Amino acid sequence: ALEEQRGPLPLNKTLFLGYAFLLTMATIPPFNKQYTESQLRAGAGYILEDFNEAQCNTAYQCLLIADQHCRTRKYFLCLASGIPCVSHVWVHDSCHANQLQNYRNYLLPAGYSLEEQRILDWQPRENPFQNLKVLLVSDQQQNFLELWSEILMTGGAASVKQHHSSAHNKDIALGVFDVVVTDPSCPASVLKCAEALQLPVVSQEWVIQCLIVGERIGFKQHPKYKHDYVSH
């Protein structure tokens, strides 16, 4: 009863030609990332190993393939870049019919919204970070500064300045930024400076929530947006 859903390998060897795919999963037909990927390659679909908006802009019609909405780096890059998030069931129904299906009937939800308190469907949207000048403050290159800088930029931000929390000497102009995105490792000097400059400071959750809702949301419409909010 498992192959049934899965579908066969595409008989038409060029079924996915002209498409690039990015695959991920979270942490309702079980999602077999391996078999799905072989289905795509068997149809000449191109497999991207990591987000790359070069080929996604010129060479191929890129699709993110997953079992449901996720909170991964790749899910975020795609929501921010307008690369559609599609259910792997789309790959399967396409192989089954040896004919490309309308991926608009397989869109995955954008994600769980704190404000709406429920899963939100994905819908067309403007760059959520259009012309935003951001200052990222954290003590981790990869995971924060490298991560969010990329997500903010492809989300239409005008500029993102990376600034290592402790290991960095505050020789920047805080007045040029609209928002400070940071975590608990933010130096008190920056917070105190931002407070007086009236420049809002938030946590990564603020960025994620904007990506999910599809719009720039309140800097303070929810506790998790305070840079210092801890589990609890």
By the rule CB under 8 A, 25 interacts with a copy of itself? yes
Q: How far is the CB of 10 from other proteins (least distance, A)?
A: 14
- Candidates 123, 142, 169, 198: give the one binding other proteins (CB under 8 A): 123
> Residue 20 is encoded by which pair of tokens?
């690039």
Report 36-95 residues binding other proteins (CB under 8 A): 87, 89-90, 93
Q: How far is the CB of 117 from other proteins (least distance, A)?
A: 11
How far is residue 18's CA from residue 54's CA, in Å, rounded to a whole number?
14
3-class SS string, 168-202: CCCCCCHHHCCEEEECCCCCHHHHHHHHHHCCCEE
Write the burial class of residue 113 (CB in 10 Å: 0-12 exposed, 13-18 middle, 19+ buried): middle
Nearest to a copy of itself of 57, 221 (CB atom): 57
Report 209-228 residues binding other proteins (CB under 8 A): none
Look at residues 87, 83, 67 and name the one whose alpha carbon lies nearest to residue 19. Answer: 83
Nearest to other proteins of 117, 142 (CB atom): 117
By the rule CB under 8 A, 105 interacts with other proteins? yes
How far is residue 18's CA from residue 14's CA, in Å, rounded to a whole number?
9
By the rule CB under 8 A, 130 interacts with a copy of itself? no
Q: Which residues in this chain contact other proteins in the complex, by CB under 8 A?
A: 5, 87, 89-90, 93, 96-97, 101, 104-107, 109, 121, 123-124
